[PDB]
Design a protein around this nucleic acid. Structure first.
Ligand SMILES: Nc1ncnc2c1ncn2[C@@H]1O[C@H](COP(=O)(O)OP(=O)(O)OP(O)(O)=S)[C@@H](O)[C@H]1O
Ligand SMILES: Nc1ncnc2c1ncn2[C@@H]1O[C@H](COP(=O)(O)OP(=O)(O)OP(O)(O)=S)[C@@H](O)[C@H]1O
Ligand SMILES: Nc1ncnc2c1ncn2[C@@H]1O[C@H](COP(=O)(O)OP(=O)(O)OP(O)(O)=S)[C@@H](O)[C@H]1O
Ligand SMILES: Nc1ncnc2c1ncn2[C@@H]1O[C@H](COP(=O)(O)OP(=O)(O)OP(O)(O)=S)[C@@H](O)[C@H]1O
Ligand SMILES: Nc1ncnc2c1ncn2[C@@H]1O[C@H](COP(=O)(O)OP(=O)(O)O)[C@@H](O)[C@H]1O
Ligand SMILES: [Mg+2]
Ligand SMILES: [Mg+2]
Ligand SMILES: [Mg+2]
Ligand SMILES: [Mg+2]
Lengths: 317, 325, 134, 330, 418, 341
DNA sequence: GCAGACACTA
DNA sequence: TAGTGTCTGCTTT
């Protein structure tokens, strides 16, 4: 029964959590003071939001959090009536809490919860904010309605830098006592793209499939991310080079055409070097190829035509 | 159980060693199960690679007699809504062992069709109940999957089947049923496979019925090309040569004669021409742009329907005009 | 429907490692299950404990939005025929030991009507955690 | 009695005339029980429905039509839930029990066949749901997909189902069949009427059969006892006369917009279908050897564009006027 | 401890964050409602969150009820034992109806019942309509506060009709209650920069001992003015100020980043954003901000109708033709996110190219498609009546196309002479 | 009664004043009704294809074809949305009303064709304007006429049959109904004015009506009706040929586009287009009429006309797939202004 | 975002 | 007194 590294090596205190020094320091300060108001935590997945909330609740309450709170996550019936009733009962049932401590309502993955439940939560806060406090763990703050965010201090988690992920990887390697190579670690960081959970999964797979962590083994088990390949494809000068890159990196690797079109659209949205006219022309061509793919024609000829038209509009004769 | 099923579901692998092509994935999964750790395997690739066959063989090898009870199979055939993932998956991935302390495997085949709320509930399930139950996700389109799910699942890429895997499977099929196949037909099947085992098995099943005598004879290029209907490479080369040197009259006559001699399709001719023209050296890139754009437009029009003669003359005119640069 | 009948199956158990056994009347258990359903109690607990003074303890307690519910089944021999707790060998009876079972409410709701018309109900579970109800 | 399309519909596998490969594969399957999932595709009116009906008749028989055959079409609701539940219910039924007469007479396979016509117009979600039902339940059931649009069927379905292309029914592919029909129905042709009918027809035999029936009815009504000529089938087929096409070409040759527009209006007020006019103009322009390569390529591209526009459900008058104006200005 | 916005609640009418005109025209509105005969039976308040839409009425009831603090605020989280939520609001209205004398308790429905199911949404309209035309002596005041916030996009919404797109008074309320004679709609605006700055001054000087403990007394002015200018919500401003004051330092504070409006987005696409000079980042941020509005019909029509107001229709005709052609080409992509991006990008690029001749602009108009549909329905029912009356004495089959094209003018002309 | 469209309608098959080739062809078809296959009619609007269908039904069935039999049927789509259709009934045949929306068109066709079929002579179904279907109803008709081709006959009349899918065109016999020449329309009008003995000094007005309606029987008859009732049943050679508000509005819009080419002119064109489109009309015929009126301007040269017709074809293609119509209409108008300026 | 009209002291 | 700050629009079966 070997527990996976994502769950076995998850942090239990806020000290082990790295990536945003200011936010962790703020969480430690607000736990030491104990005056924790409502907050919303948002960011790209795999950065350490829900584990940070759990660790904060742990080292803020202890036995009280362990025994006498009601934590709800996405794996429950999040209907309006049942959630209303559950949070209404949880707002009651006060204990001999310390004067600087309050109940915490952990809300994990609240982006998919219905608007009526948000209104019921609004009423619950406006009626019993004195006894309990709410904590929100989500990906983006747009899915939360406007009135909820006015009663809370929104905290944003930035993407983890390479230094913090590398430090965590070295700590986990020292804990596991496994050989490593600097090239392999650099490849792991490059493949992760700031995703801590993906980096942990890749390192665990490398360790359990090849032993020593090396760049060659990592590249063998997992290839380069497709956004980088598509970005290099769109920035290619010659059409033949772009066609060869497309074929040898997506057609021979087993990549669906619709996924390639979606990645091209995402890259073109976030591209910055191209001009506005070139960007909109590329977006139009990507959309035309996407509707052609959706209507049924899912062959490589459509991708080749998209690349040819993109090169033609880039060169402009 | 055998000799009563289609060839696709007749040579389905039952063990891990019977899966060919993705040797690295098989070795990595074997190391994972030898160490005793399943890191929420996620399989991605084109259809026909063998993701579900591999995962079913792996589950059989791990479990044995516990496949009936502890292994759960999920698909798009049954209802997969918010209530289904909320109740059935939660109830199944909450139980203890019965005879062996092995992990719990849940097969999410073609899981790309699930709703966003269902995907979010599923990923909150995988995060919470990971200490005893490990899920497996199978999909062909990664754009339909929530990016949070990909972070929590170890992604494994299923490459198209290489030439050696197709040749080994062809040899295994031939030995089992005592069938002889010519090396030219083998090369034709390698070219036509395009990294698909199901297509190879389907065309091999039909070529057996094409021959009047199942035994005491071989399968040549003519039988393979007549069975599926793919154009011969010689026919494609002759059509391209006629287009290149003859402008419209004898070129159109040759194209019509080739198409009417056997019943060739415009589409298959289009992939034949693009395949034999991809290796051409054209240092202007305007010919390449024009050829790609016009051929894609013609293929789209054929997919939408139209006149066969009109589309064939359109192909001829596009090829002639593009090469004029 | 006999196409993909996987056969075998069976949530059976071995009698060599039975944690404890209990025999109770159907009427006594039906009242407990009926009260357990309408109140809610999405998570339920099974407690088994023997006493040297023959004061055996067995109850179906649960937690819900109401709080803590303690449906204490009777301990006398009038409607509780037999109750002993084993040490994982099904032959070595031990007194003072407690067996705690964490069961879902959905499983309990299925046997509520089964015990509505019954004479004797037999409870048996092992160390593996599976429960057999006769 | 019955129209010749349905009266002369094939009932046996050997009654076909052009699709040799699929029919002989099914015939060699008749002595076995390893029939795979089939994907029938090709031009309209090539007999895919006739082929599957004949195969079913050879396999099961009229007694087993009502017990081992399920057909789902566009005539009823084809939603995701209804199709899902119906396919799951029928693809789970046990093997039927044939009588001793059925086993003695016909070779009864141990499986059942599910036929899904016009599968092109089926949503992708339904096909995704049906993928696993086709795959893991295929022990004693099979699925047949018939559709004239290959691209409308997604990639996973094209892999599980064996691809059986149906050849376009050209002239020599159906000359014998039309000759047999003419002898059976007592239809007289002088030199090349049947060949002309297949030339007019777009690679199908049903339209040709309907045209032959109309010509025979007209000849019977006329009652003079003469044979059908090519002019009669050309007139009843909507074929533009050669003189009018020559006039169209001559007016296009002259570089005047007003006369061209007036003649286009006069041609369109006759209500003639623009597709036939486009095809006749295209074949005349390619057949003519008085034009160079660049003009031929340009006019072929414009004709292809106009054909796509017309097939996309646009106005015939505007499209034909634009095509003739573009041709005149080359 | 205690929230700053809760411990610093206003106690008089001079501490609430509201404009003088808004205070005046809610005071005159509420004063006339307390009379036995009132022109407006109920009061409707619509505006953004945190705009003093409820506290102002709270002290207003505090200083008007004792003339003849009695507030009957509806609690939607009540269940009421074995009572459906649909009938709960019906019982609340009749329970608070019997307060016309002696008690005189004002009704403040801040938390309206959730209206998302078909049955419960339709019930909400006639429940207040039955209370309007009821011929009963006297009248207790009733104030309904509705927050204007758009509901975020969800999955598998099927037809994707109204209400669920944006939770606003116009979407849920029907036409009968919107322009009812016995109803006043007093809109609300976000808190001004001056009022927010004054309130933050008051909070800072009230918390002088806490702020002077750390190194925040010198830095407070920049933080508070940035907070006041960044958002118009007083509650969010107080929350951010409390978080910053509790914070030791070196922490970048965050704000809700409230979504922009429909006409605001239209102006952003046509004119441009001064905050973001770069064109690429403006559209990309707007997409992730409100995709729920861009991936919706009538927005492209709004761009089509308001693009001639850039220079009062005095710009390049070729540029206008290119813009309209690009929108028409976008319309063929079956309403995809890629389709919306290309057309808006082209419009913004063109208007940036011709931005030099943009000194004077015009007003934008939301497209009149509802009127076109209404006249279409009227013509449809008129044609149905014409076919019904013309088929009872003879036979006439010409399909619907010939009636609209040929018989739409010839047929009335012939009957005019006869 | 009210109009010449329905009053002096040709009852018998032998009372047709148009060309006799089509009449002889349909008489040959109607000689053996048992062997008659599914039929499809294509031609210009107003030619009278429904008259040929009624004459064929008279030849096959006999007297009693024209029966009112107004019936109302209720149909239920997915979820919950009641639909109403005032379908017309008749003994031995039934006519389909295509007035329902294209999206929810499968339910009505499927239910009513199953109701006419049942299991059981045959009952014929007439389906006018079959081009409005979104190919789903077309597939439904295809399957219905394939599977149940023992007791059902489909006779569909339509104009510009290009949107009709290829499989349907293969399974149905093609009937061509060309519009009559000016001589036949003049003869019909002369027969009408002789029947009612109205005043007529010069026959040039009859030729003017015949040539001004573009070979349309209904349009010519209604134009004759409008001027006859407005002139006390006394036609005059000096009486101008009047046109509906449709043609006047189209010509005024064309003149405004040709004269004024500006963004203000564009928004007034938008207002005119919205006022036109507020009457439940398809935009394809509006685009065709605008293109034909633009090509009739004498001041334009061949290059402007070629550009106008090319962009008209392009925007008609765009309108073919587009959900809206105002976008493509304004695009075509703006392109025309750009070319003219 | 922008046009039209008002509050308020610099 | 001319600038700077800010309310109303600009919206439906
Ligand atoms: N700063 C960190 N230091 C160490 N491990 C981390 C850190 N951030 C994330 N992890 C690891 O990430 C895994 C799960 O993190 P999560 O908090 O669940 O991801 P997330 O950022 O919350 O994204 P979502 O929305 O939950 S999918 C665990 O294995 C953690 O150990
Ligand atoms: N590597 C392989 N070696 C041998 N046979 C294979 C291999 N991959 C696929 N096959 C055969 O292909 C058949 C169909 O492939 P499956 O594994 O069932 O489906 P899949 O390849 O995973 O594609 P999807 O995603 O399910 S559509 C199997 O039953 C095998 O007979
Ligand atoms: N090989 C053939 N020999 C003789 N008649 C044939 C043959 N193929 C087709 N037919 C004729 O074609 C008609 C049957 O064709 P269908 O099967 O209905 O058309 P289809 O194949 O279904 O085309 P679809 O479904 O519209 S794509 C009958 O009139 C047959 O006589
Ligand atoms: N000077 C002030 N003026 C107004 N509100 C203040 C002030 N000082 C503190 N507050 C608080 O700010 C909040 C504003 O409340 P309101 O905006 O009236 O409520 P609301 O408008 O109903 O909010 P929603 O949209 O319903 S969640 C209350 O919690 C007040 O106690
Ligand atoms: N052979 C004919 N002789 C005289 N009038 C005819 C003839 N055929 C049709 N019509 C006229 O056509 C009118 C009906 O046209 P209609 O069937 O509505 O055209 P469409 O079928 O194109 O809609 C009738 O009023 C009738 O007077
Ligand atoms: Mg989380
Ligand atoms: Mg699979
Ligand atoms: Mg068919
Ligand atoms: Mg409030």
């Amino acid at each position: 029964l070997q527990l996976p590294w994502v769950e076995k090596y998850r942090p239990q205190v806020l000290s082990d959590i790295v990536g945003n020094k200011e936010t962790i320091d703020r969480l430690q300060q607000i736990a030491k003071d104990g005056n924790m108001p409502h907050m919303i935590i948002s960011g790209m997945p795999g950065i350490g939001k829900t584990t940070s909330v759990h660790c904060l609740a742990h080292e803020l309450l202890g036995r009280s959090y362990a025994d006498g709170v009601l934590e709800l996550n996405a794996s429950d019936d999040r209907g309006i009536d049942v959630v209303r009733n559950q949070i209404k009962h949880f707002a009651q049932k006060k204990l001999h809490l310390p004067p600087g401590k309050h109940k915490i309502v952990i809300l994990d993955e609240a982006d998919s919860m219905t608007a009526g439940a948000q209104q019921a939560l609004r009423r619950t806060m406006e009626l019993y904010s004195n006894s309990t406090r709410f904590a929100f763990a989500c990906n983006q703050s747009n899915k939360i309605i406007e009135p909820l965010q006015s009663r809370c201090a929104i905290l944003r988690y930035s993407k983890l830098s390479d230094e913090d992920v590398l430090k965590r990887l070295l700590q986990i390697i020292k804990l596991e006592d496994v050989k490593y190579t600097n090239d392999g670690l650099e490849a792991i960081i490059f493949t992760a793209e700031g995703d801590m959970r993906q980096a942990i999964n890749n390192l665990q797979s490398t360790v359990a499939g090849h032993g020593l962590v090396n760049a060659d083994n990592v590249f063998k088990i997992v290839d380069s991310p497709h956004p980088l390949i598509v970005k290099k494809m769109l920035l290619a000068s010659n059409l033949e080079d772009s066609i060869q890159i497309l074929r040898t990196d997506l057609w021979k690797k087993g990549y669906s055409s619709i996924d390639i079109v979606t990645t091209s659209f995402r890259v073109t949205k976030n591209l910055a070097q191209v001009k506005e006219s070139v960007r909109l022309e590329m977006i139009k061509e990507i959309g035309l190829t996407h509707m052609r793919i959706l209507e049924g024609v899912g062959t490589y000829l459509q991708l080749a035509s998209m690349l040819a038209k993109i090169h033609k509009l880039n060169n402009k004769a | 159980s055998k000799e009563n099923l289609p060839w696709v579901e007749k040579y389905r692998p039952e063990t891990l060693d019977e899966v060919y092509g993705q040797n690295e994935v098989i070795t990595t999964v074997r190391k994972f199960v030898d160490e005793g750790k399943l890191p929420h395997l996620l399989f991605y690739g084109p259809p026909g690679t063998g993701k579900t066959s591999t995962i079913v063989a792996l589950a059989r090898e791990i479990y044995g007699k516990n496949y009936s009870n502890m292994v759960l199979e999920l698909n798009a055939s049954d209802d997969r809504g918010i209530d289904v993932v909320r109740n059935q998956i939660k109830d199944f991935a909450s139980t203890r062992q019965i005879f062996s302390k092995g992990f719990k495997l849940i097969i999410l085949d073609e899981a790309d069709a699930m709703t966003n709320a269902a995907q979010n509930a599923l990923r909150r399930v995988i995060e919470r109940y990971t200490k005893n139950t490990r899920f497996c996700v199978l999909a062909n389109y990664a754009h339909k999957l929530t990016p949070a799910l990909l972070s929590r699942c170890t992604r494994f890429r299923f490459q198209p089947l290489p030439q050696e895997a197709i040749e080994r499977r062809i040899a295994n099929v031939l030995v089992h049923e005592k069938l002889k196949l010519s090396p030219n037909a083998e090369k034709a099947l390698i070219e036509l496979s395009n990294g698909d085992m199901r297509r190879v098995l389907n065309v091999l099943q039909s070529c057996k019925a094409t021959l009047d005598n199942p035994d005491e004879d071989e399968i040549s290029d003519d039988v393979i090309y007549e069975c599926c209907g793919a154009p011969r490479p010689s026919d494609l080369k002759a059509v391209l040569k006629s287009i290149l040197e003859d402008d419209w009259g004898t070129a159109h006559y040759t194209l019509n004669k080739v198409r009417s001699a056997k019943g060739l399709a415009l589409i298959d001719l289009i992939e034949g021409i693009v395949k034999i023209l991809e290796d051409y050296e054209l240092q202007n890139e305007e010919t390449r742009v024009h050829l790609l754009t016009k051929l894609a437009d013609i293929e789209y029009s054929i997919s939408k329907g139209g006149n066969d003669q009109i589309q064939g003359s359109a192909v001829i005119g596009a090829i002639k005009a593009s090469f004029e640069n | 429907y006999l196409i993909k009948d996987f056969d075998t199956n069976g949530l059976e158990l071995d009698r060599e490692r039975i944690s404890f056994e209990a025999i109770i009347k159907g009427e006594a258990l039906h009242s407990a299950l009926k009260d357990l359903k309408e109140i809610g109690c999405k998570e339920c607990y099974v407690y088994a404990k023997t006493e040297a003074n023959d004061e055996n303890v067995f109850a179906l307690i649960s937690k819900s939005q109401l709080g803590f519910s303690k449906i204490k089944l009777p301990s006398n021999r009038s409607i509780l025929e037999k109750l002993q707790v084993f040490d994982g060998d099904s032959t070595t009876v031990i007194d003072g030991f407690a067996v705690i079972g964490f069961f879902d409410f959905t499983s309990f709701d299925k046997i509520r009507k089964s015990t509505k018309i019954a004479s004797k109900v037999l409870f048996r579970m092992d160390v593996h955690g599976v429960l057999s109800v006769n | 009695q019955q129209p010749w399309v349905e009266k002369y519909r094939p009932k046996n596998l050997d009654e076909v005339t052009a699709q040799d490969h699929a029919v002989t594969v099914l015939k060699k399957t008749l002595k076995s029980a390893n029939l795979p999932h089939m994907l029938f595709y090709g031009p309209p009116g090539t007999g895919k429905t006739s082929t599957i009906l004949a195969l079913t008749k050879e396999l099961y028989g009229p007694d087993l039509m009502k017990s081992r055959i399920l057909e789902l079409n566009a005539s009823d609701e084809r939603g995701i839930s209804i199709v899902r539940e119906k396919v799951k219910n029928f693809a789970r039924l046990t093997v039927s029990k044939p009588s001793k007469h059925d086993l003695e007479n016909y070779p009864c396979p141990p499986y059942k066949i599910i036929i899904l016509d016009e599968a092109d117009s089926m949503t992708a979600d339904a096909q995704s749901a049906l993928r696993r039902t086709m795959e893991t339940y295929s022990g004693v059931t099979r699925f047949c997909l018939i559709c004239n649009y290959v691209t409308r069927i997604i990639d996973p379905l094209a892999s599980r189902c064996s691809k059986f292309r149906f050849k376009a029914l050209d002239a020599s592919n159906a000359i014998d069949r039309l000759r047999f029909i003419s002898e059976q129905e007592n239809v007289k042709c002088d030199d090349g009427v049947l060949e002309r009918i297949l030339d007019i027809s777009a690679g199908d035999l049903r339209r040709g059969i309907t045209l032959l029936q109309s010509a025979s009815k007209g000849a019977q009504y006329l009652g003079d006892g003469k044979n059908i000529t090519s002019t009669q089938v050309e007139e009843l087929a909507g074929v533009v006369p050669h003189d009018i096409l020559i006039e169209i070409v001559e007016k296009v040759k002259s570089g005047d917009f007003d006369e061209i527009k007036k003649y286009v209006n006069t041609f369109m007020k006759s209500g003639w279908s623009a597709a036939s006019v486009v095809n006749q103009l295209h074949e005349y322009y390619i057949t003519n050897d008085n034009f160079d390569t660049n003009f031929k390529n340009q006019i072929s591209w414009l004709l292809f564009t106009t054909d796509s526009r017309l097939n996309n459900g646009t106005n015939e008058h505007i499209q034909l006027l634009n095509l003739l104006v573009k041709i005149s200005q080359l | 401890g205690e929230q700053w916005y809760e411990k610093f609640k206003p106690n008089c009418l001079e501490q609430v964050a509201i404009h003088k005109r808004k205070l005046k025209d809610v005071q005159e509105a509420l004063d006339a409602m307390f009379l036995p005969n009132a022109k407006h039976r109920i009061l409707l308040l619509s505006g953004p969150s945190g705009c003093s839409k409820s506290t102002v009425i709270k002290e207003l009831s505090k200083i008007l009820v004792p003339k003849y603090h009695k507030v009957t605020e509806f609690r939607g989280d009540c269940i009421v034992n074995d009572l459906p939520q649909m009938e709960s609001f019906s019982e609340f209205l009749k329970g608070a109806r019997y307060l016309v004398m002696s008690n005189l308790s004002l009704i403040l429905i801040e938390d309206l019942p959730n209206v998302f199911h078909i049955d419960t949404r339709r019930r909400f309209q006639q429940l207040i309509l039955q209370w309007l035309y009821s011929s009963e002596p006297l009248l207790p005041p009733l104030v309904i506060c509705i927050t204007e916030c758009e509901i975020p996009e969800n999955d598998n919404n099927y037809r994707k009709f109204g209400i669920d797109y944006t939770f606003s008074a116009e979407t849920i309320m029907n036409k009968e209650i919107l322009m009812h004679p016995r109803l006043k709609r007093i809109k609300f605006n976000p808190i001004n920069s001056t009022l927010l700055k004054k309130h933050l001054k008051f909070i800072c000087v009230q918390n002088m001992k806490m702020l002077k403990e750390k190194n925040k007394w010198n830095k407070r002015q920049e933080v508070i003015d940035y907070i006041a200018q960044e958002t118009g919500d007083i509650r969010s401003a107080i929350t951010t100020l409390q978080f910053w004051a509790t914070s030791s330092g070196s922490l970048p504070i965050s704000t809700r980043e409230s979504t922009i409006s429909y006409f605001h987005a239209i102006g952003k696409v046509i004119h441009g954003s001064h905050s973001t000079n770069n064109d690429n980042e403006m559209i990309n941020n707007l997409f992730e901000n409100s995709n729920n509005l861009l991936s919706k019909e009538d927005f492209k029509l709004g761009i089509l109708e308001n693009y001639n107001t850039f220079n009062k229709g005095e710009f390049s005709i070729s540029d206008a033709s290119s813009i309209v052609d690009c929108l028409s080409e976008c319309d063929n992509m079956n309403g995809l996110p890629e389709s919306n991006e290309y057309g808006l990008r082209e419009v913004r690029k063109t208007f940036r190219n011709i931005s030099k001749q943009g000194h004077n602009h015009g007003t934008v108009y939301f497209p009149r498609e509802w009127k076109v549909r209404k006249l279409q329905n009227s013509f449809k029912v008129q044609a149905e009546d014409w076919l019904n009356v013309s088929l009872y004495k003879y036979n006439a089959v010409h399909s619907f196309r010939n009636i609209t094209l040929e018989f739409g003018y010839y047929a009335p002309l012939i009957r005019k002479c006869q | 009664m009210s109009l010449w469209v329905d009053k002096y309608r040709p009852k018998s098959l032998n009372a047709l004043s148009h060309n006799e080739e089509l009449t002889n062809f349909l008489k040959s078809l109607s000689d053996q009704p048992r062997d008659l296959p599914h039929l499809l009619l294509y031609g210009p609007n107003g030619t009278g294809k429904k008259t040929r269908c009624m004459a064929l039904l008279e030849s096959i069935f006999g007297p009693g074809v024209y029966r009112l039999k107004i019936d109302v049927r209720q149909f239920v789509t997915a979820s919950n949305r009641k639909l109403e259709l005032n379908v017309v009934s008749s003994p031995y045949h039934l006519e389909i009303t295509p007035s329902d929306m294209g999206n929810n068109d499968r339910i009505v066709i499927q239910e009513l064709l199953k109701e006419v079929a049942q299991m059981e002579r045959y009952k014929c179904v007439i389906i006018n304007e079959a081009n409005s279907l979104t190919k789903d109803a077309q597939a439904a008709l295809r399957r219905t006429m394939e599977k149940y081709s023992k007791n059902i006959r489909l006779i569909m009349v339509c104009d510009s049959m290009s949107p009709i899918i290829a499989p349907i065109k293969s399974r149905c016999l093609l009937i061509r109904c060309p519009a009559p020449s000016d001589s036949e329309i003049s003869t019909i009008l002369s027969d009408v004015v002789t029947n009612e003995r109205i005043q007529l000094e010069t026959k040039d007005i009859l030729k003017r009506i015949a040539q001004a309606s573009n070979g349309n029987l209904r349009v010519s008859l209604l134009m004759l009706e409008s001027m006859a009732l407005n002139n006390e049943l006394a036609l005059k050679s000096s009486s101008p040929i009047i046109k509906p508000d449709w043609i006047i509005v189209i010509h005024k819009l064309t003149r405004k586009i040709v004269k004024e080419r500006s963004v203000n002119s564009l928004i007034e064109c938008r207002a005119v287009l919205y006022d036109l489109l507020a009457h439940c009309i398809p935009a394809n015929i509006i685009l065709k009429e605008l293109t034909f009126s633009l090509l009739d301007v004498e001041t334009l040269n061949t290059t402007n006309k070629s550009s106008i017709i090319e962009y008209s074809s392009v925007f008609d293609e765009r309108l073919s797939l587009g959900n809206k119509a105002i976008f493509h209409l304004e695009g075509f108008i703006a392109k025309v202004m750009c070319c003219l300026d």
